[PDB]
RNA sequence: AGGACCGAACCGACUAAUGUUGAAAAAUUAGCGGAUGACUUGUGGCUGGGGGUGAAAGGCCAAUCAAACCGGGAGAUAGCU
RNA sequence: GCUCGCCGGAAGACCAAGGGUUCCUGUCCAACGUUAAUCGGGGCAGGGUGAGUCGACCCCUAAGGCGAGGCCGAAAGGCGUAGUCGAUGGGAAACAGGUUAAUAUUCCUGUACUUGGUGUUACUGCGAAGGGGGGACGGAGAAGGCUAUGUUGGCCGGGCGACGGUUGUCCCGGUUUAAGCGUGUAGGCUGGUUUUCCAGGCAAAUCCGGAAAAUCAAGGCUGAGGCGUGAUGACGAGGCACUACGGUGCUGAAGCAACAAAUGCCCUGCUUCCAGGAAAAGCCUCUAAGCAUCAGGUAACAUCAAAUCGUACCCCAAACCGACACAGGUGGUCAGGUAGAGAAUACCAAGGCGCUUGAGAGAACUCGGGUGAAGGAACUAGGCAAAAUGGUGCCGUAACUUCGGGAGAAGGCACGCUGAUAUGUAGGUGAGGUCCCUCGCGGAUGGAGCUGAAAUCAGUCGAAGAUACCAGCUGGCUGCAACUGUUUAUUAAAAACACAGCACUGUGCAAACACGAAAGUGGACGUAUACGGUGUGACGCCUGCCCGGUGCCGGAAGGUUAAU
């Protein structure tokens, strides 16, 4: 539910919450939880290699099943949960053999719904098939790039791929970027979109809300001294340079894709 | 006012102690130099 | 068993003080200087063997040696171990 | 409920006076701001010098910073005093 | 020694960190101590630190470190797997009283508890490097039930007052007791129980998960406190006997209740929210290989063991960090009384101190304060500084507004004491007694007693009743930045930085990008509703024209054009 907060304080005036009542109010399933401590955007040399990352709430990692490889055995959605580690919600599902798994919650799935995976599975949202067994035109998510590897594409809240064509060993997919891409038709996809499409309508409303999510401040290059950043310097607000990154590469138009290995699999780029 | 020396024996012995010195070649050179100069105390250790 | 040679090393001296005197009269406890590596087990065994008495329990402390100046040179006396040896009954040592 | 309000602890440092061979190589006094948070704090850990780190002041990196400190090249060079 | 003053959410007490003998005693006064010193954290000597239960070590892991092989790198080395370390976190168990010049949960007395090894006896499926459970976790809020503790009364001992009065509705003091053991209460959670089946838990499982049946409903788990015991003890005001007059020795009354009550406990609860809240072992259980009338397990009992190191002392400080016996800095714990919302503030208790030069004098001038005729900002760059405002309840409150605000707008009134209402009320607590009783730490009734607002009326004192301390100045116009934040440690706190929001642009995952000769790693156990870069900076109304220049994107005919 998209809900505006009332302006009882200046930090609340602009907050827009997305509140789902279906989300389990209790604690997650413990055997699918792991520790995932934070990085600060710092690598094994201890250097900041991605800026603007630090703090934020402690988070446990939910082991989500992106492979969706337990074929033939039906499963019931027990409950939908909040996952802190991603934008989509997750569903705790119970397989008829007494095994529980987390999956990415599709749009329109609810506690009680039955899902299945495999070649024989019916064409309904939450069902994972090899994409050769999925009608051309179908909306899908959690799409594999290599068979058995696990879903890598359309996983974020609201996202989905369309199977625009199938030609033998390959399906052509329209991705959320608008990139037309080829993928092996043995690659699995789950039917339907990812849920929580209202995620994007959330308004954080205050600085601290971003800080809660572990995002540290961005200082503009033009606010720095020349020694710090190409945009640095000036007596007043000055610029007079072509926009670049902190390492001097043009950052308004210049393409940076250089991967000749995977160029064969791209039918048409996003444009 | 908080001055710069804020003593901690653990931090002392881990930063500058004998076994830290011994752990790297540059640390072992430190010891070699100090033995050559004939220092009574090679390390903070003692 | 602890060997007799070991036992003949562990007990160094009777410690003499007012506290040691009071200990002996009040609570039948002899205060001994002992070897710094002497265990409570070794002290009990030695007192029983050498002083021919029956020990209830040994308590031990390590005394840190004093830093002392001697003609403008700065020394340090050795650490030593003291043992409060509680005797049973009336053993009388 | 709240980067909500008033206000101690706690964190800070707007004004004034004092002090300026100080009580103090940055404080004291009287006022002052924040005070459930983008808060504050203990312990431990990690990032190293053209390097770090920086809600960005060229700030900070052991009273040192438009390139730390220590040793070395080294008795640099000094048409200057 | 007697007065006086100061601190008392500390300037008391106990610690960690850090220091290291500064501790106690005797002796000394050169030097040290901002003076003197007979004194000392000074000199010299001697003494002093006692643990199965406190802590460390130890078992277990976090961040992170190291790292057999390995991968990578001119060399040096880098990274990392298995492992192994690493607390600031998880893991067995002791309390009260007494005692030293100096230690004490360590000694002593009394009364306990824990784990492990043996042996003995009985019972008996034991067995992991594996499975499962558990450990095991957020912020906020709310309300009960409690206790620490306090107050008053009762009780007991003592008093009858340096000056009017004081045998009383009078004064002073005490009125304390643990862990453990037993009991299972307010509260919290959850339906139990049995049978059968099973694509799951890498194998197996009797366990966990799942499914289907039947049956029964209280069953279990957890849990403060109270109560009993511990305790016929200990402690105890005081009295008596000594004194080496500092201190000991000896004996010992009362030792109850009510009320109030935490920020502590039940509560790792409950409710609620979004930002969605360690790990591993101990522990419990399950089996595998294996072992088999054996080991081994369980229980009882007996016996033995529980080492080693720390333990003095300071610790918001004269002992640590600051060159100083330096107005500085330093994390945790404890939390008395009266007034008060309070850990604010004032005065006090316990306790601790008067800050290691004093003595006079009573000039200018400086510092820190108090008061001020008439005037009242005329001062000045500027109301800088000072003066002022200041509480609670109630009445009342504008433009404008994003409808929240603005607002404590502004402004105003009441305020002490005494009596009455009512010998103390509303309210809270609740004894006895009575009745019921799945019979108890029960329920209902009942109201003794205790505690106790707030108000109204009447009276009364003073110049003044929020009397001290404490404690908003207010309003009008306007620039800038939406806001809370952040910043030049030590002359700049701002209009600067950030910020939510917006936009552009890159990026298809072995992502872009970043660190890195590399291997790797971060981005991310994320996947275009994502991530990076750039500019703008809430919100409202909006954001015009120019692609010539420079840059980027696309194109690729033709011109030119490298190595070869
Ligand atoms: Mg960023
Ligand atoms: Mg931004
Ligand atoms: Mg600047
Ligand atoms: Mg440049
Ligand atoms: Mg300009
Ligand atoms: Mg210009
Ligand atoms: Mg003993
Ligand atoms: Mg000991
Ligand atoms: Mg606030
Ligand atoms: Mg405020
Ligand atoms: Mg600051
Ligand atoms: Mg101040
Ligand atoms: Mg405030
Ligand atoms: Mg500048
Ligand atoms: Mg500096
Ligand atoms: Mg240079
Ligand atoms: Mg040369
Ligand atoms: Mg020279
Ligand atoms: Mg000394
Ligand atoms: Mg002394
Ligand atoms: Mg002198
Ligand atoms: Mg003299
Ligand atoms: Mg001395
Ligand atoms: Mg390594
Ligand atoms: Mg190797
Ligand atoms: Mg490790
Ligand atoms: Mg270990
Ligand atoms: Mg620890
Ligand atoms: Mg003492
Ligand atoms: Mg009580
Ligand atoms: Mg509190
Ligand atoms: Mg002590
Ligand atoms: Mg002094
Ligand atoms: Mg001081
Ligand atoms: Mg402090
Ligand atoms: Mg105070
Ligand atoms: Mg006072
Ligand atoms: Mg004068
Ligand atoms: Mg004056
Ligand atoms: Mg005045
Ligand atoms: Mg006047
Ligand atoms: Mg006047
Ligand atoms: Mg006037
Ligand atoms: Mg004027
Ligand atoms: Mg004038
Ligand atoms: Mg002023
Ligand atoms: Mg004033
Ligand atoms: Mg103007
Ligand atoms: Mg501002
Ligand atoms: Mg400054
Ligand atoms: Mg300033
Ligand atoms: Mg990757
Ligand atoms: Mg700007
Ligand atoms: Mg324009």
Curated annotation (Swiss-Prot), chain A:
Biased composition, class Low complexity, residue ranges: 38-47
Consequence of substituting residue 229 to Q: Loss of peptidyltransferase activity in reconstituted ribosomes. No change in rRNA binding or assembly into ribosomes
Leader sequence segment: none
Sites bearing N6-acetyllysine, chain numbering: 241
SMART domains recorded: Ribosomal_L2, Ribosomal_L2_C
MF-aspect GO terms: RNA binding; rRNA binding; structural constituent of ribosome; transferase activity; zinc ion binding
Protein name stated in the entry: Large ribosomal subunit protein uL2
Species: Escherichia coli (strain K12)
UniProtKB/Swiss-Prot annotation, chain B:
Assigned GO CC terms: cytoplasm; cytosolic large ribosomal subunit
Example GO molecular function: structural constituent of ribosome
TM spans (from-to): none
BP GO terms, sorted: cytoplasmic translation
Database matches in InterPro entries: Ribosomal_bL34, Ribosomal_bL34_CS
Keywords, in A-Z order: Ribonucleoprotein, Ribosomal protein
Subunit (UniProt): Part of the 50S ribosomal subunit.
Family classification: Belongs to the bacterial ribosomal protein bL34 family.
NCBIfam families per UniProt: rpmH_bact
Name of the molecule in the record: Large ribosomal subunit protein bL34
Species the sequence originates in: Escherichia coli (strain K12)
Lineage: Bacteria, Pseudomonadati, Pseudomonadota, Gammaproteobacteria, Enterobacterales
Gene: rpmH
UniProtKB/Swiss-Prot annotation, chain C:
Parts forming coiled coils: none
Pfam families to which the protein is assigned, alphabetical: Ribosomal_L23
Family: Belongs to the universal ribosomal protein uL23 family.
PROSITE patterns xrefs: RIBOSOMAL_L23
Known partners and oligomeric status: Part of the 50S ribosomal subunit. Contacts protein L29 and trigger factor. Might also contact SecE and probably does contact SecG and SecY when the SecYEG translocation complex is docked with the ribosome.
Gene: rplW
InterPro entries: Nucleotide-bd_a/b_plait_sf, Ribosomal_uL23-like, Ribosomal_uL23/eL15/eS24_sf, Ribosomal_uL23_CS
Alphabetically ordered keywords of this record: Ribonucleoprotein, Ribosomal protein, RNA-binding, rRNA-binding
GO MF annotation terms: rRNA binding; structural constituent of ribosome
NCBIfam families for this protein: PRK05738.1-1, PRK05738.1-3, PRK05738.2-4
Gene Ontology CC terms: cytoplasm; cytosolic large ribosomal subunit
Role of this protein: One of the early assembly proteins, it binds 23S rRNA; is essential for growth. One of the proteins that surround the polypeptide exit tunnel on the outside of the subunit. Acts as the docking site for trigger factor for Ffh binding to the ribosome (SRP54) and to nascent polypeptide chains.
Protein name (database record): Large ribosomal subunit protein uL23
GO BP field: cytoplasmic translation; ribosomal large subunit assembly
